[PDB]
Amino acid sequence: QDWLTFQKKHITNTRDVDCDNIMSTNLFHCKDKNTFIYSRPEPVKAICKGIIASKNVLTTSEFYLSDCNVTSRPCKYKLKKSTNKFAVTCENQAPVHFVGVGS
Structure with missing residues:
Protein backbone atom coordinates (compact mmCIF):
# COMPACT_ATOMS: atom_id res chain seq x y z
CA GLN A 1 0.00 0.00 0.00
CA ASP A 2 2.96 2.22 0.69
CA TRP A 3 6.72 2.01 0.95
CA LEU A 4 6.83 1.57 4.73
CA THR A 5 4.46 -1.41 4.59
CA PHE A 6 6.33 -2.77 1.57
CA GLN A 7 9.48 -2.78 3.71
CA LYS A 8 7.74 -4.58 6.55
CA LYS A 9 6.46 -7.26 4.18
CA HIS A 10 9.21 -7.77 1.60
CA ILE A 11 12.64 -6.88 2.92
CA THR A 12 14.76 -9.34 4.88
CA ASN A 13 18.13 -8.75 6.56
CA THR A 14 18.95 -12.45 6.12
CA ARG A 15 18.51 -14.96 3.30
CA ASP A 16 17.59 -17.61 5.88
CA VAL A 17 14.03 -16.43 6.43
CA ASP A 18 12.40 -18.33 9.32
CA CYS A 19 9.36 -19.33 7.23
CA ASP A 20 7.33 -21.39 9.66
CA ASN A 21 7.58 -18.74 12.36
CA ILE A 22 7.37 -15.53 10.33
CA MET A 23 4.45 -16.64 8.16
CA SER A 24 2.24 -17.63 11.13
CA THR A 25 2.03 -14.09 12.44
CA ASN A 26 -0.60 -11.39 12.09
CA LEU A 27 1.65 -9.67 9.51
CA PHE A 28 1.66 -12.55 7.01
CA HIS A 29 -1.38 -14.42 8.37
CA CYS A 30 -0.55 -17.79 6.83
CA LYS A 31 -0.65 -16.49 3.26
CA ASP A 32 0.29 -19.00 0.56
CA LYS A 33 3.48 -17.27 -0.49
CA ASN A 34 5.66 -14.33 0.42
CA THR A 35 8.79 -13.12 -1.33
CA PHE A 36 11.47 -11.51 0.80
CA ILE A 37 14.21 -9.43 -0.81
CA TYR A 38 17.65 -9.73 0.81
CA SER A 39 18.87 -6.15 1.04
CA ARG A 40 18.92 -3.05 3.20
CA PRO A 41 15.70 -1.12 2.61
CA GLU A 42 17.22 1.97 1.06
CA PRO A 43 18.76 0.33 -2.06
CA VAL A 44 15.42 -1.36 -2.80
CA LYS A 45 13.67 2.02 -2.69
CA ALA A 46 16.07 3.08 -5.43
CA ILE A 47 14.47 0.67 -7.91
CA CYS A 48 11.79 3.30 -8.36
CA LYS A 49 13.98 6.40 -8.64
CA GLY A 50 12.47 8.91 -11.04
CA ILE A 51 9.17 7.08 -11.40
CA ILE A 52 6.22 9.18 -10.27
CA ALA A 53 2.85 7.97 -11.56
CA SER A 54 1.91 4.45 -10.51
CA PRO A 95 7.94 0.70 -4.22
CA VAL A 96 4.38 0.57 -2.85
CA HIS A 97 3.42 -2.96 -3.85
CA PHE A 98 5.12 -6.23 -4.68
CA VAL A 99 3.97 -7.50 -8.07
CA GLY A 100 5.82 -10.75 -8.62
CA VAL A 101 9.04 -12.51 -9.49
CA GLY A 102 10.52 -12.38 -12.99
CA SER A 103 10.62 -15.31 -15.41
Whole structure:
Protein backbone atom coordinates (compact mmCIF):
# COMPACT_ATOMS: atom_id res chain seq x y z
CA GLN A 1 0.00 0.00 0.00
CA ASP A 2 2.96 2.22 0.69
CA TRP A 3 6.72 2.01 0.95
CA LEU A 4 6.83 1.57 4.73
CA THR A 5 4.46 -1.41 4.59
CA PHE A 6 6.33 -2.77 1.57
CA GLN A 7 9.48 -2.78 3.71
CA LYS A 8 7.74 -4.58 6.55
CA LYS A 9 6.46 -7.26 4.18
CA HIS A 10 9.21 -7.77 1.60
CA ILE A 11 12.64 -6.88 2.92
CA THR A 12 14.76 -9.34 4.88
CA ASN A 13 18.13 -8.75 6.56
CA THR A 14 18.95 -12.45 6.12
CA ARG A 15 18.51 -14.96 3.30
CA ASP A 16 17.59 -17.61 5.88
CA VAL A 17 14.03 -16.43 6.43
CA ASP A 18 12.40 -18.33 9.32
CA CYS A 19 9.36 -19.33 7.23
CA ASP A 20 7.33 -21.39 9.66
CA ASN A 21 7.58 -18.74 12.36
CA ILE A 22 7.37 -15.53 10.33
CA MET A 23 4.45 -16.64 8.16
CA SER A 24 2.24 -17.63 11.13
CA THR A 25 2.03 -14.09 12.44
CA ASN A 26 -0.60 -11.39 12.09
CA LEU A 27 1.65 -9.67 9.51
CA PHE A 28 1.66 -12.55 7.01
CA HIS A 29 -1.38 -14.42 8.37
CA CYS A 30 -0.55 -17.79 6.83
CA LYS A 31 -0.65 -16.49 3.26
CA ASP A 32 0.29 -19.00 0.56
CA LYS A 33 3.48 -17.27 -0.49
CA ASN A 34 5.66 -14.33 0.42
CA THR A 35 8.79 -13.12 -1.33
CA PHE A 36 11.47 -11.51 0.80
CA ILE A 37 14.21 -9.43 -0.81
CA TYR A 38 17.65 -9.73 0.81
CA SER A 39 18.87 -6.15 1.04
CA ARG A 40 18.92 -3.05 3.20
CA PRO A 41 15.70 -1.12 2.61
CA GLU A 42 17.22 1.97 1.06
CA PRO A 43 18.76 0.33 -2.06
CA VAL A 44 15.42 -1.36 -2.80
CA LYS A 45 13.67 2.02 -2.69
CA ALA A 46 16.07 3.08 -5.43
CA ILE A 47 14.47 0.67 -7.91
CA CYS A 48 11.79 3.30 -8.36
CA LYS A 49 13.98 6.40 -8.64
CA GLY A 50 12.47 8.91 -11.04
CA ILE A 51 9.17 7.08 -11.40
CA ILE A 52 6.22 9.18 -10.27
CA ALA A 53 2.85 7.97 -11.56
CA SER A 54 1.91 4.45 -10.51
CA LYS A 55 3.76 2.06 -12.81
CA ASN A 56 4.84 -1.56 -12.52
CA VAL A 57 8.59 -1.88 -13.03
CA LEU A 58 10.83 -4.94 -13.42
CA THR A 59 14.23 -4.61 -11.72
CA THR A 60 17.25 -4.14 -13.97
CA SER A 61 19.54 -6.18 -11.69
CA GLU A 62 18.79 -9.60 -10.29
CA PHE A 63 18.32 -9.80 -6.53
CA TYR A 64 18.67 -12.55 -3.94
CA LEU A 65 15.15 -13.65 -3.04
CA SER A 66 13.81 -15.90 -0.31
CA ASP A 67 10.33 -17.32 -0.80
CA CYS A 68 8.17 -18.92 1.86
CA ASN A 69 5.83 -21.31 0.04
CA VAL A 70 2.99 -23.14 1.77
CA THR A 71 3.00 -26.95 1.81
CA SER A 72 0.11 -29.46 1.93
CA ARG A 73 -0.54 -28.39 5.52
CA PRO A 74 -2.09 -24.93 5.77
CA CYS A 75 0.31 -22.41 7.35
CA LYS A 76 3.33 -24.73 7.09
CA TYR A 77 6.16 -23.70 4.76
CA LYS A 78 9.25 -24.46 2.74
CA LEU A 79 11.98 -21.88 2.15
CA LYS A 80 13.13 -21.47 -1.42
CA LYS A 81 16.07 -19.20 -2.28
CA SER A 82 16.58 -17.85 -5.79
CA THR A 83 18.39 -15.23 -7.80
CA ASN A 84 15.99 -13.31 -9.99
CA LYS A 85 14.59 -10.00 -11.10
CA PHE A 86 11.25 -8.95 -9.64
CA ALA A 87 8.50 -6.41 -10.27
CA VAL A 88 7.02 -3.75 -8.02
CA THR A 89 4.53 -0.94 -8.33
CA CYS A 90 6.49 2.33 -8.21
CA GLU A 91 4.78 5.52 -7.10
CA ASN A 92 6.39 8.80 -6.10
CA GLN A 93 9.80 7.16 -6.44
CA ALA A 94 9.23 4.28 -4.04
CA PRO A 95 7.94 0.70 -4.22
CA VAL A 96 4.38 0.57 -2.85
CA HIS A 97 3.42 -2.96 -3.85
CA PHE A 98 5.12 -6.23 -4.68
CA VAL A 99 3.97 -7.50 -8.07
CA GLY A 100 5.82 -10.75 -8.62
CA VAL A 101 9.04 -12.51 -9.49
CA GLY A 102 10.52 -12.38 -12.99
CA SER A 103 10.62 -15.31 -15.41
